[PDB]
UniProtKB/Swiss-Prot annotation, chain A:
Protein name: Fanconi anemia group B protein
Parent-record interval covered: 153 to 329 of 859
Gene transcribed to yield this protein: FANCB
Function of the protein: DNA repair protein required for FANCD2 ubiquitination.
Organism: Homo sapiens (Human)
Reported disease: Fanconi anemia complementation group B: A disorder affecting all bone marrow elements and resulting in anemia, leukopenia and thrombopenia. It is associated with cardiac, renal and limb malformations, dermal pigmentary changes, and a predisposition to the development of malignancies. At the cellular level it is associated with hypersensitivity to DNA-damaging agents, chromosomal instability (increased chromosome breakage) and defective DNA repair. Some severe FANCB cases manifest features of VACTERL syndrome with hydrocephalus.
Subunit structure as annotated in this protein's UniProt entry: Belongs to the multisubunit FA complex composed of FANCA, FANCB, FANCC, FANCE, FANCF, FANCG, FANCL/PHF9 and FANCM. The complex is not found in FA patients.
Protein location: Nucleus
Curated annotation (Swiss-Prot), chain B:
Function: DNA repair protein that may operate in a postreplication repair or a cell cycle checkpoint function. May be implicated in interstrand DNA cross-link repair and in the maintenance of normal chromosome stability. Candidate tumor suppressor gene.
Protein name: Fanconi anemia group G protein
Disease: Fanconi anemia complementation group G: A disorder affecting all bone marrow elements and resulting in anemia, leukopenia and thrombopenia. It is associated with cardiac, renal and limb malformations, dermal pigmentary changes, and a predisposition to the development of malignancies. At the cellular level it is associated with hypersensitivity to DNA-damaging agents, chromosomal instability (increased chromosome breakage) and defective DNA repair.
Lineage: Eukaryota, Metazoa, Chordata, Craniata, Vertebrata
Subunit structure, as described in the record: Belongs to the multisubunit FA complex composed of FANCA, FANCB, FANCC, FANCE, FANCF, FANCG, FANCL/PHF9 and FANCM. The complex is not found in FA patients. In complex with FANCF, FANCA and FANCL, but not with FANCC, nor FANCE, interacts with HES1; this interaction may be essential for the stability and nuclear localization of FA core complex proteins. The complex with FANCC and FANCG may also include EIF2AK2 and HSP70.
Amino acid sequence: ISSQTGKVVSVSGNFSSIQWAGEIENLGMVLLGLKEDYAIWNTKFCVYSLESQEVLSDIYIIPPAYSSVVTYVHICATEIIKNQLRISLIALTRKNQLISFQNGTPKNVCQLPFGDPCAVQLMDSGGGNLFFVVSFISNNACAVWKESFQVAAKWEKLSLVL
Amino acid sequence: CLDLWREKNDRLVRQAKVAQNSGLTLRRQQLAQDALEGLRGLLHSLQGLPAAVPVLPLELTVTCNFIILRASLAQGFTEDQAQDIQRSLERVLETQEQGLRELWDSVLRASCLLPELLSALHRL
């Protein structure tokens, strides 16, 4: 239900999960997720332009191998080569791994200390000292480097993070 | 993507052989402990996948290179290498429990099913 609409709209397509959602340049509103092997272009994960609009991409999202493990997604940048598109996007898994993807190219995997990661945010922290800040259901958390997918600190009990 | 991991293996093995042939006492161990961590990270990335029949002949390759290079630099073995081998074999089985002796019994019957990675198994 949107403000500007005020109506209960149903999603036409039949998905399992909506690992990510949000606004992108040129598109207005978007959901990642799936419907129902080592080729980058296979991907197993439908974009969907919201309001029963186009699937929009089945081309350069993460491989289907990862599709069995990934629990959460967090996009970091969206470029458009032609009608197609190119997203560089972070995932994380039930197997305590944090992965980078560039056009669905698995690059820069790290292995997390703790179990059942929930979410990730991005911390700027000056010039290029960029950290991915990972939460867990276990009420603990990681701050992992960018540049080098490498654990910097891993605190515990952490009622909340901001 | 197998190609990428394969490429990485290739690259780092060649880098290790280069350190083996060329290099000074410090620079040798520098490139070696570089390749070591390359192979660690690769291991962890592949250990992040479920099973993958086509991956195992690589993973086992990788673990073998890892252990060798590990043990070669240590100039000696450890029990982490037993656990490494433990993990590799357990992975082999979890495609298709108790301890190394019964694992190997079940493993080698699992190899008499004829998956073509015996080259690796016999190296293990």
